[PDB]
Design a binder for these strands. Structure first.
Ligand SMILES: [K+]
Ligand SMILES: [K+]
Ligand SMILES: [K+]
Ligand SMILES: [K+]
Ligand SMILES: [K+]
Ligand SMILES: [K+]
Ligand SMILES: [K+]
Ligand SMILES: [K+]
Ligand SMILES: [K+]
Ligand SMILES: [Mg+2]
Ligand SMILES: [Mg+2]
Ligand SMILES: [Mg+2]
Ligand SMILES: [Mg+2]
Ligand SMILES: [Mg+2]
Ligand SMILES: [Mg+2]
Ligand SMILES: [Mg+2]
Ligand SMILES: [Mg+2]
Ligand SMILES: [Mg+2]
Ligand SMILES: [Mg+2]
Ligand SMILES: [Mg+2]
Ligand SMILES: [Mg+2]
Ligand SMILES: [Mg+2]
Ligand SMILES: [Mg+2]
Ligand SMILES: [Mg+2]
Ligand SMILES: [Mg+2]
Ligand SMILES: [Mg+2]
Ligand SMILES: [Mg+2]
Ligand SMILES: [Mg+2]
Ligand SMILES: [Mg+2]
Ligand SMILES: [Mg+2]
Ligand SMILES: [Mg+2]
Ligand SMILES: [Mg+2]
Ligand SMILES: [Mg+2]
Ligand SMILES: [Mg+2]
Ligand SMILES: [Mg+2]
Ligand SMILES: [Mg+2]
Ligand SMILES: [Mg+2]
Ligand SMILES: [Mg+2]
Ligand SMILES: [Mg+2]
Ligand SMILES: [Mg+2]
Ligand SMILES: [Mg+2]
Ligand SMILES: [Mg+2]
Ligand SMILES: [Mg+2]
Ligand SMILES: [Mg+2]
Ligand SMILES: [Mg+2]
Ligand SMILES: [Mg+2]
Ligand SMILES: [Mg+2]
Ligand SMILES: [Mg+2]
Ligand SMILES: [Mg+2]
Ligand SMILES: [Zn+2]
Lengths: 143, 53, 118, 49, 102, 155, 110
RNA sequence: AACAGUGGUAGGAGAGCGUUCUAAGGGCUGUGAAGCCAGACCGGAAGGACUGGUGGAGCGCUUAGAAGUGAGAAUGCCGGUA
RNA sequence: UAUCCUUGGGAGUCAGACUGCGAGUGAUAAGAUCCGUAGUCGAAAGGGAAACAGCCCAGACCGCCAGCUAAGGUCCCAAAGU
RNA sequence: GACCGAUAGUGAACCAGUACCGUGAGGGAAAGGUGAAAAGCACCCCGGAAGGGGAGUGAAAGAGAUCCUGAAACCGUGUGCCUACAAGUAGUCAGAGCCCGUUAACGGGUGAUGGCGUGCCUUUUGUAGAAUGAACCGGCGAGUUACGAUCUCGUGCAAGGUU
């Protein structure tokens, strides 16, 4: 008897989140939940019930402590000695969209559906986004 | 070096995707109307380029 | 008198193979591997009949939490408030209302809020 | 009595135990002999006394 | 109109005319069963039980006493020669909900 | 068994090095054409019950025929000519449809010959009565002389 | 209506016959005969004779127009294997499977 | 009815399933036996039916009896085929 | 509270492991070794400790899309307090 | 004959102590089934033939010659559902969509996606084990019998019982 959402039934809103002055992880955890559709009572584990999220002002995201200097983003190229590193400061300055995407991707489910859920995220450096056509509502983070 | 595991029916079939003959490079003979290989003498009538060979 | 192996062996093995219909490759074809997979399927089915009850409760709670938060309550406080009000409607039913009749759910959420605000 | 309705006296006849006929019987595999040693062997065990 | 009733140690949302499978009741096919424990009534006149809605009953006709599709419960322990096969057919009562008497 | 099967003397191949399972004889029981393990051996199935138990068994089945009303005591059974048609007529005369054990006192030749070919009709002397013959035949046709001869032994 | 021909227990390995069969399956019989004629494979002449036999059966037995025929079924089944042995080094023998094929063609009117 | 209990290797104990043969009784079968193939049926398990196809002459059932009575492993044996 | 003893039939076991505590041997080393003592594993599935026989919680007759708890948890992965 | 029924029963149901192996002594197989009857497929057609398709015979030829039945592995043809962003002990539980329609059942096939999940056996303190064993399928393949002993149970008779 428990209802199950499906591709026919699901209806996705577009939400704008302003990242300006928000803590990276605290914003990310709320956005990850919205992308998964945890805020909807029709939440169904095996389908994507979540909403689209636009993040603007990704360059203005905040980090506490000495994380700007000391938080390191590692990656390995799969070649010997191929560990590359960037600081959070370097990420925020040069790759702010990747920084938010990395935070949120790590908080999403792993697997096919989790990868599909991430496609509804759209992160932007500045104030503007190109999704006027999707008629996005402002979403304040609960916190 | 020997097979560590036997190959499944599936994997054998996947390998044989490309193990396939092509259709001959054939055209209609303008003399007799039988199919011939392009750029070859027609075996049926012995013609090539409108000339009996 | 001699008893030949006869038909009993074929009959027994064939039943296992019919239980393995739909399994991949040799697992629906060969007795030994089909047998193992049917046995494994038994262990899994037993385990999962138990896990099914966990997974649905988990699903209902998630949906109640979503509906509660639309009414300005967390799941934790809603269930506390329902318990104080003496409402004994279970999570399956609460999650059913959350999806199907959200106005009815909101009344129960309002009843919970009344007890909490005492 | 009838040859088509024969019946033994109750408790006069038991079914023999057949070891080594699968795990369900409880005498599958090792046939009630446990694991290894002289007592599990064919013709095994020491002489009386 | 619908009601949430307790039967068989479980709760079921019922409407009038709905066929429902519940845990076996001591009754025969044709007989009328009454469900006393009504936790909630919905539709127009919403009533909330504490725990039950006082005076509310749901009546139902017993369609069938049956047993569900068979489950072969098979369990084993690797390497210990422990197998256990057991068939199961869970009894049920099929009822048609006649009247929600809120 | 493996000893009695033809041949099988030599070790099929060396103990080690070939990569084969070790084998001692081509007639070992796991081999096709090999010896049987155990299996039937010539033996008797006979045993003797105590004499008193033998007597109680025969009296039990005789007394069971009286209870069932399958006891036809005859004054005498004298077939003049050894003729099967006459024996068949006598059995129809006594309403003996199914099987029947005929019991004479001494070895009656004409009765024995006449009944020989009728299916399910056995003839015995009084001394030749036995549990299995009594129980297997529905009717028991005893002569008066034979009853006296049976009662001599059993009582 | 259908007309069948079979060449049973032809001394060619099934896998090799199937390579050539896959070229002609589904084709119009005229096109199929051309493909077989110009395919340089051992199976080609064998398959050609089965195809022409099926066409002749269609004409003679069933009174079907030969110009309207299509190959509706075409398949190679395994025949019985001739088992042989090749002497290898070190006094070892290794099996040689001289495989045979059953070659079926069914022609039907388009 | 009530109350209590029911994880399990070695291992003890119990109750059963199925196989071939025999006896007795009672049946089936060329209007189609056994076997084989298929199915969404039945039993707590071992297992057992029913229906259809193939098959072309044998075979169940009941009660008791007797065992060459149950295989997935032995670098098992033989055959077939990867 | 329901064990205990005796007699008789049938066994299996005689490689143990880790953990806590008390000792020896060792270097107050060892996932070492050897005793004592209690537990768990062995022969114990379930939840927790990422994974993890032996730790923490807890003993699976079977079914349920009911409920309450244990250890452990309640920002997201991930059920529950941003 | 409560003996076997073609891997059984003789090694040998068949031209078997043959074939084959070995210098030799010696070792030592495999291999049964058309049909009631040959009525063993005249004739036509493709093909050099083999083989086939008709026709005829027959109850049956998908009984047409290692010709009763004809399992499985294994090899193919066709296609209902799924499949080219996916990390897989291959299932299991949850589950749309699509395709079906049954021994009529809270049905069948398929399975996007989600959760959970390291084969079986043996041997081990402990094995997913980077220990052992099995290529797969089929058949065959291991507590028996005799005579004694002892215990339990059963039956008969009982200070007797039994040959
Ligand atoms: K024992
Ligand atoms: K049949
Ligand atoms: K045996
Ligand atoms: K084997
Ligand atoms: K200790
Ligand atoms: K032989
Ligand atoms: K297919
Ligand atoms: K899955
Ligand atoms: K090794
Ligand atoms: Mg026999
Ligand atoms: Mg067998
Ligand atoms: Mg639970
Ligand atoms: Mg045991
Ligand atoms: Mg075993
Ligand atoms: Mg062993
Ligand atoms: Mg040992
Ligand atoms: Mg021992
Ligand atoms: Mg010898
Ligand atoms: Mg033999
Ligand atoms: Mg040489
Ligand atoms: Mg127990
Ligand atoms: Mg328990
Ligand atoms: Mg026992
Ligand atoms: Mg038979
Ligand atoms: Mg039938
Ligand atoms: Mg046997
Ligand atoms: Mg110790
Ligand atoms: Mg140690
Ligand atoms: Mg002490
Ligand atoms: Mg052990
Ligand atoms: Mg314990
Ligand atoms: Mg655990
Ligand atoms: Mg875990
Ligand atoms: Mg283990
Ligand atoms: Mg709680
Ligand atoms: Mg949560
Ligand atoms: Mg045979
Ligand atoms: Mg033989
Ligand atoms: Mg010579
Ligand atoms: Mg046939
Ligand atoms: Mg015949
Ligand atoms: Mg045949
Ligand atoms: Mg894709
Ligand atoms: Mg990607
Ligand atoms: Mg070790
Ligand atoms: Mg490995
Ligand atoms: Mg070893
Ligand atoms: Mg191996
Ligand atoms: Mg095998
Ligand atoms: Zn030309």
């Amino acid at each position: 008897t428990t209802p199950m959402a499906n591709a026919s039934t699901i209806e996705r809103k577009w939400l704008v989140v302003d990242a300006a002055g928000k803590t990276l992880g605290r914003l990310s955890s709320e956005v990850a939940a919205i992308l998964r559709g945890k805020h909807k009572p029709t939440y169904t584990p095996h389908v994507d019930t979540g909403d689209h999220v636009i993040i603007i002002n990704a360059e203005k995201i905040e980090l506490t402590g000495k994380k700007l200097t000391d938080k390191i983003y590692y990656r390995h190229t799969q070649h010997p000695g191929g560990l590359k590193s960037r600081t959070a400061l370097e990420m925020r300055t040069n790759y702010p969209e990747k920084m938010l995407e990395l935070a949120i991707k790590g908080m999403l489910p792993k697997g096919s559906l989790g990868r599909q859920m991430f496609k509804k995220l759209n992160v932007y450096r500045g104030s503007e986004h190109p999704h006027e056509a999707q008629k996005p509502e402002v979403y304040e983070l609960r916190g | 070096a020997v097979p560590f595991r036997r190959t499944s029916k599936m994997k054998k079939r996947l390998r044989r995707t490309h193990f396939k003959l092509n259709v001959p490079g054939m055209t209609e003979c303008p003399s007799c109307g039988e199919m011939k290989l392009s750029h070859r003498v027609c075996k049926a009538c012995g013609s090539y380029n409108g000339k009996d060979i | 008198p001699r008893v030949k192996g006869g038909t009993v062996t074929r009959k027994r093995r064939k039943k296992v193979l019919k239980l393995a219909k739909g399994y991949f490759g040799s697992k629906h074809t060969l007795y030994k591997v089909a047998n193992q997979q049917v046995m494994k399927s038994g262990n899994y089915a037993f385990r999962d009949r138990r896990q099914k009850k966990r997974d649905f409760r988990k699903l209902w709670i998630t949906r109640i939490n979503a509906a509660a938060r639309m009414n300005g309550l967390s799941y934790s406080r809603l269930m506390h408030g329902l318990k104080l009000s003496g409402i004994e409607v279970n999570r399956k039913m609460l999650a059913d209302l959350a999806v199907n009749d959200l106005t009815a759910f909101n009344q129960l959420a309002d009843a919970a809020k009344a007890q909490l605000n005492k | 009595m009838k040859l088509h309705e024969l019946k033994p006296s109750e408790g006069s006849r038991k079914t023999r135990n057949r070891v080594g006929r699968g795990i369900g019987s409880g005498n599958g595999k090792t046939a009630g002999k446990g694991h290894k040693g002289q007592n599990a062997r064919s013709g095994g065990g020491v002489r009386p006394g | 109109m619908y009601a949430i009733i307790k039967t068989g140690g479980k709760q079921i949302k019922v409407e009038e005319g709905q066929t429902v499978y519940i845990e076996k009741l001591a009754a025969e096919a044709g007989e009328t069963v009454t469900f006393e424990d009504v936790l909630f009534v919905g539709g127009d006149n919403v009533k909330v039980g504490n725990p039950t809605v006082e005076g509310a009953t749901v009546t139902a006709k017993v369609e069938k006493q049956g047993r569900a599709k068979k489950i072969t419960v098979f369990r084993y322990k690797p390497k210990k020669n422990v197998h256990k096969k057991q068939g199961h057919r869970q009894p049920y009562t099929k009822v048609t909900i006649e009247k929600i008497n809120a | 068994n493996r000893s009695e099967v033809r041949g099988g003397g030599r070790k099929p191949w060396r103990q080690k090095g070939t990569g084969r399972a070790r084998q001692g004889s081509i007639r070992s029981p796991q081999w096709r054409g090999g010896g049987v393990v155990f299996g039937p051996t010539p033996r008797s199935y006979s045993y003797k019950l105590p004499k008193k138990v033998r007597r109680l068994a025969i009296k039990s089945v005789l007394s069971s025929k009286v209870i069932d009303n399958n006891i036809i005591v005859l004054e005498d059974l004298t077939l003049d000519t050894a003729k099967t048609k006459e024996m068949a007529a006598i059995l129809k005369g006594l309403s003996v449809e199914k099987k029947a054990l005929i019991v004479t006192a001494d070895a009656n030749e004409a009765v024995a010959l006449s009944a020989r070919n009728i299916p399910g009709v056995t003839v015995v002397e009084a001394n030749g009565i036995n549990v299995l013959d009594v129980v297997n035949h529905e009717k028991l046709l005893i002569t008066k002389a034979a009853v006296e001869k049976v009662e001599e032994v059993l009582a | 209506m259908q007309a069948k021909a079979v060449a049973r227990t032809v001394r060619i390995a099934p896998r090799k016959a199937r390579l050539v069969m896959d070229l002609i399956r589904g084709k119009q019989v005229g096109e199929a005969v051309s493909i077989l004629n110009l395919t340089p494979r051992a199976a080609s002449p064998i398959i050609e004779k089965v195809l022409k036999s099926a066409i002749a059966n269609a004409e003679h037995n069933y009174e079907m127009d030969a110009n309207n025929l299509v190959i509706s079924q075409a398949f190679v089944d395994e025949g019985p294997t001739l088992k042989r042995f090749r002497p290898r080094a070190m006094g070892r023998a290794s099996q040689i499977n001289k495989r045979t094929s059953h070659i079926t063609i069914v022609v039907s009117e388009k």
